[PDB]
Design an enzyme around this catalytic site. Structure first.
Site, PDB file in Angstrom:
ATOM      1  N   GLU A  11       0.768  -1.210   0.000  1.00 19.48           N
ATOM      2  CA  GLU A  11       0.000   0.000   0.000  1.00 19.48           C
ATOM      3  C   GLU A  11       0.807   1.272   0.000  1.00 19.48           C
ATOM      4  O   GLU A  11       0.263   2.289  -0.416  1.00 19.48           O
ATOM      5  CB  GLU A  11      -0.957   0.017   1.208  1.00 19.48           C
ATOM      6  N   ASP A  20      -6.516   6.407  -4.943  1.00 16.85           N
ATOM      7  CA  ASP A  20      -6.007   5.055  -5.076  1.00 16.85           C
ATOM      8  C   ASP A  20      -6.049   4.605  -6.555  1.00 16.85           C
ATOM      9  O   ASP A  20      -6.407   5.386  -7.460  1.00 16.85           O
ATOM     10  CB  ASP A  20      -6.672   4.077  -4.107  1.00 16.85           C
ATOM     11  N   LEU A  32      -9.060   3.743   2.776  1.00 16.63           N
ATOM     12  CA  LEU A  32     -10.029   4.384   1.900  1.00 16.63           C
ATOM     13  C   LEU A  32     -10.901   5.379   2.685  1.00 16.63           C
ATOM     14  O   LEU A  32     -11.403   5.110   3.786  1.00 16.63           O
ATOM     15  CB  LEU A  32     -10.907   3.322   1.269  1.00 16.63           C
ATOM     16  N   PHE A 104      -8.219  -6.769   3.207  1.00 16.90           N
ATOM     17  CA  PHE A 104      -7.884  -5.384   3.458  1.00 16.90           C
ATOM     18  C   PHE A 104      -8.082  -4.563   2.180  1.00 16.90           C
ATOM     19  O   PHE A 104      -8.604  -3.461   2.184  1.00 16.90           O
ATOM     20  CB  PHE A 104      -6.421  -5.333   3.884  1.00 16.90           C
ATOM     21  N   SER A 117     -12.001 -20.272  -5.694  1.00 21.16           N
ATOM     22  CA  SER A 117     -10.631 -20.171  -5.179  1.00 21.16           C
ATOM     23  C   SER A 117     -10.587 -20.501  -3.685  1.00 21.16           C
ATOM     24  O   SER A 117      -9.642 -21.127  -3.219  1.00 21.16           O
ATOM     25  CB  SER A 117     -10.072 -18.773  -5.329  1.00 21.16           C
ATOM     26  N   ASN A 132      -6.789 -20.114 -10.549  1.00 17.91           N
ATOM     27  CA  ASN A 132      -8.142 -19.578 -10.476  1.00 17.91           C
ATOM     28  C   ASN A 132      -8.148 -18.126  -9.946  1.00 17.91           C
ATOM     29  O   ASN A 132      -8.905 -17.252 -10.384  1.00 17.91           O
ATOM     30  CB  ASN A 132      -8.991 -20.482  -9.557  1.00 17.91           C
TER      31      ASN A 132
END
Ligand SMILES: [Cl-]
Ligand SMILES: [Cl-]
Length: 162
Positions: A11, A20, A32, A104, A117, A132
């Site tokens: 990040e 972002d 965010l 996250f 998955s 996948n």
């Protein structure tokens, strides 16, 4: 390496409001603020999150504080989720960090959407889950980060981060 160091690499850290990869107002270590286009709406969420009039800028300590809250929330959200919890419980420590990373980034709802998955991870079919996981908008939009997470699921090591 641990979840904090991992997410800090993915990040980055920015002390002023920024947009972002999706064009949304963010600050700190991937926190965010709002999906709204308004910078004012973002400054208002920021002040509310910090408890002071920030004028769009925060300190390192405040960034780290939002970060600790966000990691804690991601973990608690996984543990509360009927779809995620069983996957998390089945994984080793390293792979648990990969799952936290995805939550996250895209939220619990988004991850819970990776039905196939998740089943593959739970079954410990690493290679198949990695293939996948890559067939997703996630992988296509943020391929370098996706690859790092996927390699972590595939190998169970931190090699992609070293
Ligand atoms: Cl908050
Ligand atoms: Cl990327």
């Amino acid at each position: 390496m641990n979840i904090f160091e991992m997410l800090r690499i993915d990040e980055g850290l920015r002390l002023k409001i920024y947009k972002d990869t999706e064009g949304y107002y963010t600050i700190g270590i991937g926190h965010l603020l709002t999906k709204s286009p308004s910078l004012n709406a973002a400054k208002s969420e920021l002040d509310k999150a910090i408890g002071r009039n920030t004028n769009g800028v925060i300190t390192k300590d405040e960034a780290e504080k939002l970060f600790n809250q966000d990691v804690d929330s991601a973990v608690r959200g996984i543990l509360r989720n009927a779809k995620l919890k069983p996957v998390y419980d089945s994984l080793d420590a390293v792979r648990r960090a990969a799952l936290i990373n995805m939550v996250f980034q895209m939220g619990e709802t988004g991850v819970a959407g990776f039905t196939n998955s998740l089943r593959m991870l739970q079954q410990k079919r690493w290679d198949e889950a990695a293939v996948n996981l890559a067939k997703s908008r996630w992988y296509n939009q943020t391929p370098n980060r996706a690859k790092r997470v996927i390699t972590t699921f595939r190998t169970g090591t931190w090699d992609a981060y070293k």
